[PDB]
Structure 1
Amino acid sequence: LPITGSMDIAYALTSTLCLYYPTEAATEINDNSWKDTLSQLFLTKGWPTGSVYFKEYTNIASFSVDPQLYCDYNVVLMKYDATLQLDMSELADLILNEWLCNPMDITLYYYQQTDEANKWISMGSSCTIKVCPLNTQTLGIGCLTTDATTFEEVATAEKLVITDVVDGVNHKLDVTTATCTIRNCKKLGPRENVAVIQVGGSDILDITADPTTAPQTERMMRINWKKWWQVFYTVVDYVDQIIQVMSKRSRSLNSAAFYYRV
């Protein structure tokens, strides 16, 4: 129900932090107690021991598979790629926003979209998603309704794709679901659990499927590097600002993800 307060009156941490990290960082660090020293640092900042976790993913291609997010505060570090701007952006969207959705099945149904905030998610080892349009008597356009090869392509054996096609028209899809999963998902709103930091060059990042709006939100940030330790130290001795740019969760509940506190 609606609320009430007053402006004439003024006002006179123990949660859990998530620091994911990529590999090449680790293989360049050359230490195993690095975690422990960093932890001692945070402890000097007062955040108690064990309140911090560390996770290592092999590469962006894999790590994009069903990302887990198990702190009420999540910060993801992302490398740069000279050609993988698009998939970096797909991950950026998947982790930056909250997706409420349903599991599909292309082999038995015709699907569609209804709103500018509805897209199709394709996650797995490798997917080649092909779409073929339909009319109001169920005959395709420029693709034949029995051939996979005539269909149009949007992704081939990619790890992840967030595709968008014209709403309001039924389609046929091509993929071997023996290789990955497909979710028809609506963007419920902004997700505040995650701050993404690009370690390197130019912020390609675009977090919405419109050319008219390309917002540089306060969560998609950028820093350059030659030695990872300085990066981690920027991460830590700025952690108050990083935590102030983000906020706690906002959503009631997703489909039962793991959440970890101590």
Structure 2
Amino acid sequence: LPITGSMDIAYALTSTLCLYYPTEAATEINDNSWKDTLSQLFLTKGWPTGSVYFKEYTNIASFSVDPQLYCDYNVVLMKYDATLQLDMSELADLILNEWLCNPMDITLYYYQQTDEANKWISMGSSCTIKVCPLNTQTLGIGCLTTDATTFEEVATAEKLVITDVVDGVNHKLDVTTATCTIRNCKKLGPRENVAVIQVGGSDILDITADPTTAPQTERMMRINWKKWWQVFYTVVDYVDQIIQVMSKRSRSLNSAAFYYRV
């Protein structure tokens, strides 16, 4: 709907905050009441008491299992390593973006792509995704329609895979439909309710499959560390900027999932 205002007239909380931390921080701090200390620090900062929830994840891969967050304002601390950058980028792109998915099945249907705003998402314990294209008359090229060995590998021993292939061609997929489920999702736009704080070194986190584009938005932040309490203090004492850099939900067709909005 149109908005009508003016440019010459002088024109000028009750939200939720979730902090996501690795369990290694909990192991290192060696305390049980530090949640109370953080709550009281937030209360001093100007947040209401009993209005902050903390969620813990065992591992990066484990947290990649249905990562749907349940806060209006979200900031997640992500571990740093140089041997798992792909999965970190996958998680960042799945969290920072909004997606609308559809159910799929591999043993009965064929699938294809037609727009670059649609990709394949498989989530679960482990997804051994294998795929090869077809021709118009449904004959395998570099593969046989029944042989599961000649199928090219695109994902092995992965807990969360975001795959994209050449559009406009039907494809056949093979995976064990008892350990991982696949869905067809489209990128509707930006998800402004979340932010990622990469606690570590240089950033390789790419939020797009297009090579020519390297979007470095203001919703991605990087910081070095040697003690977890330093990171926690920096996060708590600087809520204003990390909150004003984000906004509320812009979704036109909301999903069905749990939410924590006190």
What range is the shorter-chain TM-score in? over 0.9
Which whole-Å deviations, capped at 9, do the CAs of 1:181-208 have from their partners, x for residues lacking one?
1011110000001110000111111000
Alignment of 1:15-54 (within 5 A): 15-54=15-54
Provide, for residues 206-254 of structure 1, a one-character-per-residue CA deviation record: whole Å limited to 9, x for no partner.
0000101011111111000000001001101110000011111110343
Residues 194, 246 of structure 1: 8 Å contact kept? yes
Q: CA deviation at 1:6?
A: 0.8
Give distance in 2, aligned partners of 1:97 and 1:58.
23
Q: Is the 8 Å Cα contact of residues 106 and 173 (structure 1) preserved in structure 2?
A: yes
User: Quick one: structure 1 residues 137 and 95, their matched pair in 2 at CA, closer, same or farther if it must change by over 3 Å?
Assistant: same
Q: 3-state DSSP class of the match of 2:126?
A: strand
Shift of 1:69: 0.9
State the 1:12 CA deviation: 4.1
Task: Using the TM superposition, name which of 149-158 and 4-13 deviates more.
Answer: 4-13
2: distance between equivalents of 1:92 and 1:133? 28
Q: Secondary structure at the match of 2:187?
A: strand
Q: TM-score, normalised by structure 1?
A: 0.98
Q: Which secondary structure state, in structure 1, belongs to the residue aligned with residue 121 of structure 2?
A: strand
Aligned equivalents of 2:42, 2:232: Cα separation in 1: 11
Query: Structure 2: which 5+ residue stretches go unaligned?
Result: none
3-state SS, counterpart of residue 159 of structure 1: strand
CA distance in 2, matches of 1:10, 1:161: 50
Q: Tell me what 1:136 maps to.
A: 136
Greater CA deviation, 247-256 or 209-218? 247-256
TM alignment of 1:195-234, pairs within 5 A: 195-234=195-234
Cα deviation, residue 10, structure 1: 2.0
Shift of 1:259: 1.0
> Is the 8 Å Cα contact of residues 100 and 254 (structure 1) preserved in structure 2?
no
Partners of 1:9 and 1:194 lie apart in 2 by: 34
How many residue pairs get aligned? The number is 262
The DSSP-based 3-state class of the residue aligned with 1:126 is strand
In the alignment, structure 1 residue 167 sits paired with structure 2 residue 167: yes
Partner-residue secondary structure (3-state), 2:229? helix
CA distance in structure 2 between the aligned counterparts of 1:212 and 1:107, rounded to whole angstroms: 36
Asked whether the 8 Å contact 1:51–1:261 carries over to 2, the reply is no
Maintained 8 Å contact 2:68/2:95: no
Aligned to 1:63: 63
When the two chains are superposed, the root-mean-square deviation of aligned CA atoms in Å is 0.9
Alpha carbons 1:218, 1:245 under 8 Å: kept = yes
Cα deviation, residue 11, structure 1 = 2.5
Q: Deviations over 1:71-109 (max 9, x none)?
A: 111111101122100000000100000001201111110
For the Cα contact (< 8 Å) 1:196–1:220, is it kept in 2? yes
Quote the Cα distance in structure 2 between the aligned partners of 1:254 and 1:139.
40
Bigger shift: residues 4-13 or 78-87: 4-13
How many angstroms does 1:168 deviate by?
0.5
Deviation, 1:261, is 2.3
Q: Please name the residue that 2:94 is paired with.
A: 94
CA distance in 1, matches of 2:177, 2:157: 12
After superposing on structure 2, the runs of 4+ consecutive aligned residues of structure 1 that deviate more than 4 Å are none
**Percent identical:** 100
Q: Secondary structure at the match of 2:53?
A: strand
Q: 1:8 to 1:128 in 2, by over 3 A?
A: same
